[PDB]
Structures are given as structure tokens and as C-alpha cells.
Design a protein around this nucleic acid. Structure first.
Ligand SMILES: [Mg+2]
Ligand code: NA
Ligand code: NA
Length: 325
DNA sequence: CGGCGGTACTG
DNA sequence: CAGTACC
DNA sequence: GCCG
């Protein structure tokens, strides 16, 4: 953590680009910032800048301006719309397009949104839980939530295997939400159980809002919603559940454990090797066109364990706490 | 030049 | 489909 | 934004 004086200013720029919808420029910035944060010693030279992976001339020039003038002139020309765009796209279900649209329509505050904006069902829930959805819970509460789900699941099939993933599995002290993966060792009993589980969890008043939940489909893969533990002092928390076939267990676990950048790096690596990795499977002999798009499926490789995914990719295994990029 | 992860709901 | 979301 |  040796370049806070520069990265702190870059994260402001990255965030501005992000809420304005400039996703690839923002991405570039993210990789540079992350790089700078892992670099033990204070970069001291424009040459020493380019040196680092994720950093190039453009970014180097910025870092040079910050160490000499102790400032970044671009930070002074960030659009005034940015704080408002950030406020709006912090509503669950509203992204950069929606935020920019609301802004163009003259809205500047959540009060404007509440009173004048047209909201999707999701966004109305997002807004109702605006503050809650910005808070992190202690991992101890995540345990309680996982256990509430696990108990309700194992109540109608004790064979069900339930594991909390995401930041919880990566071992963080606090969690943004709870990610529960459910599967079954028998390979078939996982089918059409959202039906039973969600009903059970609604029965106990545990679920309060549904954000994403295709219950008309017998093939539902995920539930994204909102729960609240019983008793006083409790806040609404975001709950994400996925149910996967046992054969996809390792890939599902890897994906659902993250982090996001870790998943992307893994998947980017797989593609270099003519393979493909998703929450469903690791595939080989994947045929692609000249534009990187999948033109041919290939074969699914057997992956009983996360270790196998690493192995098939020619990588040393990493514990969840080490995937925390 | 041009890709930068791969996928699942919503409406 | 585009937008948003998941990790 | 970075990089092949
Ligand atoms: Mg999470
Ligand atoms: Na949002
Ligand atoms: Na629904």
C-alpha cells in the first residue's frame, strides 16, 4: 500500500469514467490502480512507471504529474454530473444508462427520483433499501443468513449441500451480501427446488423482496433478493442463491467465490489457451473467429474439484483468500 | 486495429 | 434486443 | 485506459 498519494486520485478518475459509461477506459484504470497498490515501493520515475504491468505511457504521465506537482489537473475538470450519476447508479437495478437518462431529465437527488422518475420494480426496491444496500454486514451475520437458507433447504432434502461463497468464502470480515450455492451429490435432486426453498423462506417471513427470480421457469438458476433476520437491530440484507447440477459444482463454486477480477483473469487465460471457462464448465478445443467470438463449442473437461480447474489451466491452486483481487 | 469474461433475468 | 446484474 |  505504498502509492496512496497517487492511487487515491486515480480511483476518483476511474469512478468518474465508470459512472459515465466509459467502461473500457475505466477498466484500464482499474488494472493500473490495482497494480500500483501491489507495488511495494513508491514509483519514482516515468520509466519505473511503464515498467509495471497494467501501466503504460498515458498512465505513467499521470503518475509523474502527481509526484512533481503533487496534483492531477484532470481531477479539476471532472463533469459536475458525476456525483449525481454515482448517487443514481447506486440504486440497485439502475446502471449508467438509466442514471444518465435521469440526469438529462433534470433529476439531481433521490427525492427527485422518488417523486418524479419512472422506476422499474427492481429500482423501486433498490431505492427503498438505498442505505441498506450500501452497507456491509459482519461475516458473523452472513453465517446466520447462510444457516437460515441451509436449514430451510435441508428440511425437505437433507442431501442438499449449501455453501456460502463470495467475499464470505474468500474470508473477508464483512460482506456486501450473502451468496449461497446449493447442489446435490446425487446429481438429480437439485431440480425444481427454488419452488420449495423460496416458499419455505417466505413462510418464515425471512424474504422481504424479490429482485430477480424466474419462478415460472422450472429451469431457474438464481434467486436475487432481500432478507432480514428476526429480532431488533436487524437491517435488510441482499441474498443471492444459485442452484447447480452436481457436475457443474467446481466451476459454480469457483465462479461464485470470485473475486470478479479473478474470474475475468482466469477466463481470459482460458481463452488464450483455446479453452473456455464459465460457471457451468471448463471447455477445451473451443473454436473462435477472428473477433474472439465463440464459433465452436468444444468439449467439456471433467472438473470434480476447483483444483482440477487450476490444473487443467496450467496454474497452481489458490485458496479462496488468495483470489481476493 | 481492436479486444478487454461469460453468463442469467427483465420487459 | 439493451440494460443490468452476478461472481 | 492497457496490450498483443
Ligand atoms: Mg457477495
Ligand atoms: Na445500480
Ligand atoms: Na418472478
Amino acid at each position: 500500500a505504498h502509492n496512496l498519494h497517487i492511487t487515491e486520485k486515480l480511483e476518483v478518475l476511474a469512478k468518474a469514467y465508470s459512472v459515465q459509461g466509459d467502461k473500457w477506459r475505466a477498466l484500464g484504470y482499474a488494472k493500473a490502480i490495482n497494480a500500483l497498490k501491489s507495488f511495494h515501493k513508491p514509483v519514482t520515475s516515468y520509466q519505473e512507471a511503464c515498467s509495471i504491468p497494467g501501466i503504460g505511457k498515458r498512465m505513467a504521465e499521470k503518475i509523474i504529474e502527481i509526484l512533481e506537482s503533487g496534483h492531477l489537473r484532470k481531477l479539476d475538470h471532472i463533469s459536475e454530473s458525476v456525483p449525481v450519476l454515482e448517487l443514481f447508479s447506486n440504486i440497485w437495478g439502475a446502471g449508467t444508462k438509466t442514471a444518465q437518462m435521469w440526469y438529462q431529465q433534470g433529476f439531481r437527488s433521490l427525492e427527485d427520483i422518488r417523486s418524479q422518475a419512472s422506476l422499474t420494480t427492481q429500482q423501486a426496491i433498490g431505492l427503498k433499501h438505498y442505505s441498506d444496500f450500501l452497507e456491509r454486514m459482519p461475516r458473523e451475520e452472513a453465517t446466520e443468513i447462510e444457516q437460515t437458507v441451509q436449514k430451510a433447504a435441508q428440511a425437505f432434502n437433507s442431501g442438499l449441500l449449501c455453501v456460502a461463497c463470495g467475499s464470505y468464502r474468500r474470508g473477508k470480515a464483512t460482506c456486501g451480501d450473502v451468496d449461497v450455492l446449493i447442489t446435490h451429490p446425487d446429481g438429480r435432486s437439485h431440480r425444481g427446488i427454488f419452488s420449495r426453498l423460496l416458499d419455505s423462506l417466505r413462510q418464515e417471513g425471512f424474504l422481504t423482496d424479490d429482485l430477480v427470480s424466474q419462478e415460472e421457469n422450472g429451469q431457474q438458476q438464481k434467486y436475487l433478493g432481500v432478507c432480514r433476520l428476526p429480532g431488533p437491530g436487524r437491517r435488510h440484507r441482499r441474498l443471492d442463491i444459485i442452484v447447480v447440477p452436481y457436475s457443474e459444482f467446481a466451476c459454480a463454486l469457483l465462479y461464485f467465490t470470485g473475486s470478479a477480477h479473478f474470474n475475468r483473469s482466469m477466463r481470459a487465460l482460458a481463452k488464450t489457451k483455446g479453452m473456455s471457462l464459465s460457471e457451468h464448465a471448463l471447455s477445451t478445443a473451443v473454436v473462435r473467429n477472428t473477433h474472439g467470438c465463440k464459433v465452436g463449442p468444444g468439449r467439456v473437461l471433467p472438473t470434480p474439484t476447483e483444483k482440477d480447474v487450476f490444473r487443467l489451466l496450467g496454474l497452481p491452486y489458490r485458496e479462496p483468500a488468495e483470489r481476493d483481487w
